[PDB]
Amino acid sequence: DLGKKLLEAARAGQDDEVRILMANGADVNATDASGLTPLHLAATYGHLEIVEVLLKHGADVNAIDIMGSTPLHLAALIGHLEIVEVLLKHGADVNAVDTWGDTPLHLAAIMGHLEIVEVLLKHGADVNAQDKFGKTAFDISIDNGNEDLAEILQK
Amino acid sequence: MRECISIHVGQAGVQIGNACWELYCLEHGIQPDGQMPSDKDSFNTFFSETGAGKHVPRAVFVDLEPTVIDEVRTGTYRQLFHPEQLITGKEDAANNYARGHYTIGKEIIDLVLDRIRKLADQCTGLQGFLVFHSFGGGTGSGFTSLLMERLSVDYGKKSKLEFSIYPAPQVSTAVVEPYNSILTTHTTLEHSDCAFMVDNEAIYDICRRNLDIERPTYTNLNRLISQIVSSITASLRFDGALNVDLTEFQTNLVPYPRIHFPLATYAPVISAEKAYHEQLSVAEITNACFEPANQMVKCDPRHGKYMACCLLYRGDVVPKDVNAAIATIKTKRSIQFVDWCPTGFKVGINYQPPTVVPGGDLAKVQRAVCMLSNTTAIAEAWARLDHKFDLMYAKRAFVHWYVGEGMEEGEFSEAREDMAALEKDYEEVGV
Amino acid sequence: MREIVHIQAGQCGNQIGAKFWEVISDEHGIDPTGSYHGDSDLQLERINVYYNEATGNKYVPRAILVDLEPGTMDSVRSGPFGQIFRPDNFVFGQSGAGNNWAKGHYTEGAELVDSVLDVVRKESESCDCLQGFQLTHSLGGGTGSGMGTLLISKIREEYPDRIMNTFSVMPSPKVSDTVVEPYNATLSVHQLVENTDETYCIDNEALYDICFRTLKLTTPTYGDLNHLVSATMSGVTTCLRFPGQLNADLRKLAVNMVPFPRLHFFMPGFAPLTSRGSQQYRALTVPELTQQMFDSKNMMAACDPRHGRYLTVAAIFRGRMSMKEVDEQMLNVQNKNSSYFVEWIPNNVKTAVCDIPPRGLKMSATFIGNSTAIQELFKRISEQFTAMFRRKAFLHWYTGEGMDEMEFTEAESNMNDLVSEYQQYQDATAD
Ligand SMILES: Nc1nc2c(ncn2[C@@H]2O[C@H](COP(=O)(O)OP(=O)(O)OP(=O)(O)O)[C@@H](O)[C@H]2O)c(=O)[nH]1
Ligand SMILES: Nc1nc2c(ncn2[C@@H]2O[C@H](COP(=O)(O)OP(=O)(O)OP(=O)(O)O)[C@@H](O)[C@H]2O)c(=O)[nH]1
Ligand SMILES: [Mg+2]
Structure with a gap:
């Protein structure tokens, strides 16, 4: 099965191996045991080129894993701003909610990726979105004392 | 001769001991090298004599660190003390009672006992020991209580008198000082026959207004403390009729062995800058002995009852002036004694004026008086300590520092219970 | 030592x-x-x-x-x-x-x-x-x-x-x-x-x-x-x-x-706050140095002390200044901000004065505080940790070195208990 090979080729960042497996019929939307797609692992490990070649060959930009994490969730969490913009331009749900109530704005705010926060707000991120604990991205900024993030959310 | 051995534990005990022995030599006319030109009687209770006419104090200086005692080894009285009587460790108890009692203190206690035994072997008839130590220090509380326990075994018949430094926040160096104070009081209670507390706050305040010292330091406090301690031990080093030995201290001031904390009051305390002050009369200094602001421990004897009261005068004091001044106190002021005690004032007069130390903040006085009284109002000082103990112990704060140095946590409650019984002991006497 | x-x-x-x-x-x-x-x-x-x-x-x-x-x-x-x-x-x-x-x-x-x-x-x-x-x-x-x-x-x-x-x-x-x-x-x-x-x-x-x-x-x-x-x-x-x-x-x-053994994470503070290559006439008064030490903009840890309570505080003053003025400003801030210090630890603020100031400064003030507000620092790291750990991001980098995954949960549990400990003593009263 070439799905497990494409999964690890997308994680390791082997662009040439991703293009070869795709031509050999590898499941682009294959999932590991956690439900992670090659687009998930590509967006997690900062492989922008593999992210683009995946979306160009039928990758579900809004695929969710077992915990409901989208590639935008992980890209905003790890802080790959370039992958975040590419995912958003390909139809990524900016307000996707995972199993913990977190939106891509929540993870970008918690991790201090202020530039990703500004891009998510520009693309329609719901500031009123609450996690499972009743906290919004603005609530996290106040609770953590992150004044720089609070001013960004106030625009 | 009925000799007395002084023991100075910790920094407070050593520094105050250094000020006391400086004052003793000045009172007895002893040069810093130990030579006294005016004969070489009664001063022998505190000083031994060598073949070369050198008078060595019967003093032991013990500290778990050498910094403070090295000042005595390289001070003005470097040649005065026996060099082997200056015992130092390398690591202090860190403000931990358990360190000075259970761990670090055990590494030097047997050496301290052997050096004390060497001094006791030079005594014809040892009275006992005067122990100088702090309440809040790890050594002054931990090692002292351990030393008091050991002295009770090797010298069961000898008397043990304490000069204790009550903690005060203005000069305090540790937050666990209420712990160390309560822990050392419970373990020393049965091993001490008489303990003169020195409230650092009372001495601090007297230095502030009575001496016009803005920020008093240990030097200012120790010079005043040594003035009071010398007034208490003057009867042991001079001829007299009141408190001639350590046994009389318990007989006159200690009706029950548990309530052995007499309140000391000294008067007058005049700044040296007012050298031309008018000489205060016997009645004025005697009335100042009942003013709460002249006392060594912050309390209100008007709120308590007297079980004993000794008046030790120094200087131009005619005994008929004491009786007249005492007859006015008994009549004018409502000074209530306990019903089971003679409503009387024991009076001892040393007709030599008090000696002022050069460099001190005290002025020369023609007459002074130190009042030793056992009043139930000193339980207020215990209450202030026990409250600070209860506030911290309720949350078990800083307790881990003590259990980590070979001390079970039950000793905290066992010491706190004994203090609750001590406060109760003051209640059954005066209601 | x-x-x-x-x-x-x-x-x-x-x-x-x-x-x-x-x-x-x-x-x-x-x-x-x-x-x-x-x-x-x-x-x-x-x-x-x-x-x-x-x-x-x-x-x-x-x-x-x-x-x-x-x-x-x-x-x-x-x-x-x-x-x-x-x-x-x-x-x-x-x-x-x-x-x-x-x-x-x-x-x-x-x-x-x-x-x-x-x-x-x-x-x-x-x-x-x-x-x-x-x-x-x-x-x-x-x-x-x-x-x-x-x-x-x-x-x-x-x-x-x-x-x-x-x-x-x-x-x-x-x-x-x-x-x-x-x-x-x-x-x-x-x-x-x-x-x-x-x-x-x-x-x-x-x-x-x-x-x-x-x-x-x-x-x-x-x-x-x-x-x-x-x-x-x-x-x-x-x-x-x-x-x-x-x-x-x-x-x-x-x-x-x-x-308490686990609550040993101090919040340091410095005053005056100066940048390199741009030092100017500081002439900070003792009250200005005192109010800045306890200010949050001067805390070396991103925590608001006004959100928590001080368990213990050690203030260090460097430079030539009035010892009395430091004592008054210290007692004043403790009086003004009394609710920001735990009541069950009396005299929990200790002040030391050193005559040597640091380079390029005549007056300096260093703050050492054990405050329950430090949980804000640990909570911020815990939330960032939890955000990463819940998605298992880059967990193989650690487990690939023979490290157990349960060590991550054990570390997160322990730090969450640390935050709970600070909050527990933040809400404790003397009662
Ligand atoms: N009056 C007076 N009090 C002192 C002096 N030195 C310390 N103190 C007080 O004693 C307490 C501290 O105990 P110390 O005597 O310094 O300590 P120690 O017995 O050497 O114990 P460790 O050093 O902790 O092992 C505090 O309450 C101080 O205010 C002094 O010279 N005079
Ligand atoms: N304040 C301050 N933080 C620093 C400094 N150097 C690195 N850091 C911080 O330290 C963290 C990274 O740890 P480092 O000390 O660089 O790494 P290391 O301990 O050498 O470990 P490896 O490089 O992984 O082998 C980041 O949070 C940096 O911001 C410095 O000079 N000052
Ligand atoms: Mg010491």
């Missing part, structure tokens, strides 16, 4: 550690060659605390420089005092850790940690009265965090009675946007809770905020942050390098500042 063995692990540990030696050597009058060049006796009174006297008035810093990548080997020598470090104390590895906490704690760092313990033993056995160890390191990396905590555990197992002090640098996305740093910090904090006696929380989040907002530095560099660190490390260690009575050693400071 005199000599301290300094250790610096990782890039940040050696960077802020070299700045520590550069700052205190200037205060002690020690030039990079190791000779004395000052004109004050207080600079040697306790010079053996951090320096070893070598040959011909040469003071070699008792420091050990550790790292996994050899790039920092030439980085310290490129500095001013790079030649003052002993070449024997340079224990560096072949390959770095790459921000992998497991690489420093289990694989690469564990392979080289035995070589560091050899130099630690060589410096410790050359100590007359070693009081403990101090370690500068960051928590976000792999060497200073993963191996630093391993060095702490192995040194504690070898010297259990010694004080384990650390200058730990908390990570922040404002300074380094590396997402695995919450992993390394949480695993390190789990180790610091069990194996250190005193930890100075130097939060990079607060360092960036002071430079960006207060100092008005648009682009603050590591030198701008380390300027605040070196000023803090010099202030918090003032009582250890100069003659004093309060907190003069690592254990007495720990006994006074650590009421």
Whole structure:
């Protein structure tokens, strides 16, 4: 099965191996045991080129894993701003909610990726979105004392 | 001769001991090298004599660190003390009672006992020991209580008198000082026959207004403390009729062995800058002995009852002036004694004026008086300590520092219970 | 209690550690060659605390420089005092850790940690009265965090009675946007809770905020942050390098500042806040220095003290100033902000005054506080950790080095209990 090979080729960042497996019929939307797609692992490990070649060959930009994490969730969490913009331009749900109530704005705010926060707000991120604990991205900024993030959310 | 051995534990005990022995030599006319030109009687209770006419104090200086005692080894009285009587460790108890009692203190206690035994072997008839130590220090509380326990075994018949430094926040160096104070009081209670507390706050305040010292330091406090301690031990080093030995201290001031904390009051305390002050009369200094602001421990004897009261005068004091001044106190002021005690004032007069130390903040006085009284109002000082103990112990704060140095946590409650019984002991006497 | 063995692990540990030696050597009058060049006796009174006297008035810093990548080997020598470090104390590895906490704690760092313990033993056995160890390191990396905590555990197992002090640098996305740093910090904090006696929380989040907002530095560099660190490390260690009575050693400071074993993470503060290359007439008054020490914009950790309660506080004042004025301003802030101090620990604020101010300053004020508000710092790292751990992001980097996944949950559980402990004592009343 070439799905497990494409999964690890997308994680390791082997662009040439991703293009070869795709031509050999590898499941682009294959999932590991956690439900992670090659687009998930590509967006997690900062492989922008593999992210683009995946979306160009039928990758579900809004695929969710077992915990409901989208590639935008992980890209905003790890802080790959370039992958975040590419995912958003390909139809990524900016307000996707995972199993913990977190939106891509929540993870970008918690991790201090202020530039990703500004891009998510520009693309329609719901500031009123609450996690499972009743906290919004603005609530996290106040609770953590992150004044720089609070001013960004106030625009 | 009925000799007395002084023991100075910790920094407070050593520094105050250094000020006391400086004052003793000045009172007895002893040069810093130990030579006294005016004969070489009664001063022998505190000083031994060598073949070369050198008078060595019967003093032991013990500290778990050498910094403070090295000042005595390289001070003005470097040649005065026996060099082997200056015992130092390398690591202090860190403000931990358990360190000075259970761990670090055990590494030097047997050496301290052997050096004390060497001094006791030079005594014809040892009275006992005067122990100088702090309440809040790890050594002054931990090692002292351990030393008091050991002295009770090797010298069961000898008397043990304490000069204790009550903690005060203005000069305090540790937050666990209420712990160390309560822990050392419970373990020393049965091993001490008489303990003169020195409230650092009372001495601090007297230095502030009575001496016009803005920020008093240990030097200012120790010079005043040594003035009071010398007034208490003057009867042991001079001829007299009141408190001639350590046994009389318990007989006159200690009706029950548990309530052995007499309140000391000294008067007058005049700044040296007012050298031309008018000489205060016997009645004025005697009335100042009942003013709460002249006392060594912050309390209100008007709120308590007297079980004993000794008046030790120094200087131009005619005994008929004491009786007249005492007859006015008994009549004018409502000074209530306990019903089971003679409503009387024991009076001892040393007709030599008090000696002022050069460099001190005290002025020369023609007459002074130190009042030793056992009043139930000193339980207020215990209450202030026990409250600070209860506030911290309720949350078990800083307790881990003590259990980590070979001390079970039950000793905290066992010491706190004994203090609750001590406060109760003051209640059954005066209601 | 005199000599301290300094250790610096990782890039940040050696960077802020070299700045520590550069700052205190200037205060002690020690030039990079190791000779004395000052004109004050207080600079040697306790010079053996951090320096070893070598040959011909040469003071070699008792420091050990550790790292996994050899790039920092030439980085310290490129500095001013790079030649003052002993070449024997340079224990560096072949390959770095790459921000992998497991690489420093289990694989690469564990392979080289035995070589560091050899130099630690060589410096410790050359100590007359070693009081403990101090370690500068960051928590976000792999060497200073993963191996630093391993060095702490192995040194504690070898010297259990010694004080384990650390200058730990908390990570922040404002300074380094590396997402695995919450992993390394949480695993390190789990180790610091069990194996250190005193930890100075130097939060990079607060360092960036002071430079960006207060100092008005648009682009603050590591030198701008380390300027605040070196000023803090010099202030918090003032009582250890100069003659004093309060907190003069690592254990007495720990006994006074650590009421509970796990709550040993201090919030340091410095006043006045100054940037390098731009110092101006400070002329800060004692009340201005007092109000700034307890201000949140002056805290080295991004925590609002007004949101928590002070368990213990040690204030250090440097420079020539009125001792009485410091006592009044200290008692005034405690009166004005009475609700911000725990009531069940009386006299929990301790004040020390040193006559030697730091470089380029006439008046200085250093704050050392054990505040329950430090949970805000731990909660921020916990939320960043939980955000990463719930998605299992980059978890293979750690488990690939033989590290168990349950160690992540155990570290997160322990830090969550630490936050719960601070909140528990934040809500406790005297009743
Ligand atoms: N009056 C007076 N009090 C002192 C002096 N030195 C210390 N104290 C007080 O004693 C307490 C501290 O105990 P120390 O005597 O310094 O300590 P120690 O007995 O040497 O114990 P460790 O050093 O902790 O092992 C505090 O309450 C101080 O205010 C002094 O010279 N005079
Ligand atoms: N304040 C301050 N933080 C620093 C400095 N150098 C690194 N850091 C912080 O330390 C963290 C990274 O740890 P480092 O010390 O660089 O790493 P290390 O301990 O050398 O470990 P490896 O490089 O992974 O082998 C990040 O949070 C950086 O912001 C410095 O000079 N000052
Ligand atoms: Mg001491």
